[PDB]
Design a protein around this ligand. Sequence first.
Ligand code: URM
Ligand code: URM
Ligand code: MN
Ligand code: MN
Lengths: 277, 277
Amino acid sequence: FMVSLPRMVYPQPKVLTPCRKDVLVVTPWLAPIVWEGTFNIDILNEQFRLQNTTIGLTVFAIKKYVAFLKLFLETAEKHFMVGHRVHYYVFTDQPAAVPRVTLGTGRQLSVLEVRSMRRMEMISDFCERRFLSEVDYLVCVDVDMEFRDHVGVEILTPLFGTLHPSFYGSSREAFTYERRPQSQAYIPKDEGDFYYMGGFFGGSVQEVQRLTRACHQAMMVDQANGIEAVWHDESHLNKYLLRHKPTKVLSPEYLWDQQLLGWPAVLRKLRFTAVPK
Amino acid sequence: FMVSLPRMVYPQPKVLTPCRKDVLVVTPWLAPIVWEGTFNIDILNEQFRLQNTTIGLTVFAIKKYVAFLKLFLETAEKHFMVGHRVHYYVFTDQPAAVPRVTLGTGRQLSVLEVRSMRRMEMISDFCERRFLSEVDYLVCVDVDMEFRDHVGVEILTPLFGTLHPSFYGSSREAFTYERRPQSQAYIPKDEGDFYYMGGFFGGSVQEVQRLTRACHQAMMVDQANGIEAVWHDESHLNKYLLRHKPTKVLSPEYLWDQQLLGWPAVLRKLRFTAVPK
Ligand SMILES: O=c1ccn([C@@H]2O[C@H](COP(=O)(O)OP(=O)(O)C[C@H]3O[C@H](CO)[C@H](O)[C@H](O)[C@H]3O)[C@@H](O)[C@H]2O)c(=O)[nH]1
Ligand SMILES: O=c1ccn([C@@H]2O[C@H](COP(=O)(O)OP(=O)(O)C[C@H]3O[C@H](CO)[C@H](O)[C@H](O)[C@H]3O)[C@@H](O)[C@H]2O)c(=O)[nH]1
Ligand SMILES: [Mn+2]
Ligand SMILES: [Mn+2]
């Protein structure tokens, strides 16, 4: 049950005035594509706080990648779901190398020791029960990253992917989908909506468990058949999201590499960005 | 659980090419606004058929308005949810005046005798149990209307309203909301997103029962306090949708009056239109 919003004073949306005329803001299956200027964060924050939403954020930091945790977490504290309940799940082979990061109120961090298929398997087959009890949404990201600007409840939806920053202007034939028919991740040259980045996806716990289970099973089939998809879990994520359309798509504001790609006019904000590795 | 879509060949959506640049296609709370050119009906039809979706359509035909049923129903057969399961619920004081309309396969009609608050009350407090057992979505419309073009699963969502054709270009101060603070339907001059038409709303059964229950209760409070909102159930619908944001908004393609308003360039299709009364 959803209680009523309170009175709010904000600018009237005008039907004969687009928020953005330079970009596609809705997919052909009626999923919003999230760009700056498309959302009123005050309305969305109200909606999600009234449900006491808890967001889980999974991140893997294995071997040398533990070095990325301090900046990742410190900048997540500045920019990720501020004001909402957050549970970080840090999967690592080196629990003692996890930095001690000071968290805002209503935020917690769990270190989960582990030791490819690991991310999809670990998210699905290992943590299924825990996530269902503890959070409403899961957000699953790469660690070699920093938050530079707001990443908030505008992303939340049953299932989302993120446009890979190298391919958002590309034709589908150029997408680096798995192209061998012998792989479960196979996508023909005449199929595909978008190329989604493996480093930022999420949704409700149920939909994320479905996605990660399916990708893990598909990767196991490929392993039994002696094939590894060209971009590993990202290839399988792309196959899944082709056949199970996401209910929002995040623009490349949400996964950018400034060193490689600069700061094009179409990006009003760079929210979550690559760190040199 | 949602099974995989089959392989489909369709044009690639291009992120740097909007579907429509002349209109707002997403609300500030990230709800699609449904216009022609924003959706691929083949993808949506697949998604909804894979769930074996059943759509209920409620219509009231009381006193002289029984005259409108033949055209309403015959044109619904041509244009409304064709290919999907449909259950019409015709509420009337004259069961014998309901015309015998030939239905396509997978479609059925029930005549419900009845004899203001009636529509909201009847939809909620009378048919709650039945609708939950029989349909997945409810669509609630005026009868003094005809279908001229496709009205399909692109509208389906947990909760939708429709932009009133007289006010889609208007500033909120001009909207004919109830303006007396003594009414439960009261909306101040500095609030409001859109003016929604009382003659076309819907959603999941649960969300429609919530809306109609709330509107009925609010109308009962007003009656006890000796006030009737300026536009009756439409005033209450507007108050509800201000405080409970719809998850899609239908453009005025979905509720038009050609005699009164012509055929503006911004409307590529006139789908559901007023009949002279
Ligand atoms: O030693 C490691 C290696 C990885 N990881 C973890 O895996 C994440 C992705 O790897 P990376 O960012 O290097 O690849 P990217 O080029 O940014 C990401 C892309 O390429 C990958 C392989 O290099 C995969 O194919 C992925 O699916 C694709 O998105 C990384 O952020 C770490 O959280 C770790 O903790 N320790
Ligand atoms: O004798 C009747 C009267 C009504 N009805 C039923 O009520 C529906 C709305 O009424 P109408 O279309 O005349 O008003 P509109 O001007 O098109 C619709 C608007 O004005 C209404 C009052 O006239 C309400 O305030 C409504 O909320 C608002 O949307 C009509 O389609 C019939 O299904 C019936 O069956 N028998
Ligand atoms: Mn990375
Ligand atoms: Mn009417």
